[PDB]
């Protein structure tokens, strides 16, 4: 998914990276939608159906 | 980053997709140099640095 979101992106869509360097650790778009919620975490359901 | 900032998108994405091929090729080169070309005919360190 991280590879997909950074495919064919330009300056018009803003990308702001984070400090960790982990996959899906950036803010994207003018509204700055945080993409860290889509990383897997088994303690509580995030980024999946539950 | 420079390619994206300059309005080049297609070839920026092309390089981003071609990265694993590049990494595999250079890993093969490193392996060959480190584990095949080791002999007394290899250049000494004092000359390699100079």
Can you walk me through this structure?
This is part of a larger assembly, with 2 copies of chain A (50 residues). Chain A is mostly beta strands and 50 residues long. Chain A has one helix at 2-5; strands at 15-17, 26-28, 33-34. In chain A, strands 1-2-3 form a 3-stranded antiparallel beta sheet, with no helix packed on it. The interface between A and B is small, with 6 and 8 residues.
Summary keywords:
1 helix; 2 chains; mainly beta; 3-stranded antiparallel sheet; 50 residues; part of a larger assembly
- Quaternary state of this entry equals part of a larger assembly
The biggest sheet of chain A amounts to: 3 strands, antiparallel
- Biggest interface, chains and residue tallies: A-B, 6 and 8 residues
Compute the CA-based radius of gyration of chain A.
Answer: 12 Å
PDB class: viral protein
Keywords: Bluetongue virus, assembly intermediate, virion, viral protein
Entry title: Cryo-EM structure of BTV pre-core
Chains A, B: Core protein VP3
Summarize it.
Chain A: This is VP3. The structure is cut from a larger assembly and holds 2 copies of chain A (50 residues). By secondary structure, chain A is mostly beta strands.
Topology of helices and strands:
The structure is cut from a larger assembly and holds two copies of chain A (50 residues).
Chain A: H1 2-5, E1 15-17, E2 26-28, E3 33-34
PDB class: viral protein
Keywords: Bluetongue virus, capsid protein, virion, viral protein
Entry title: Cryo-EM structure of BTV pre-core
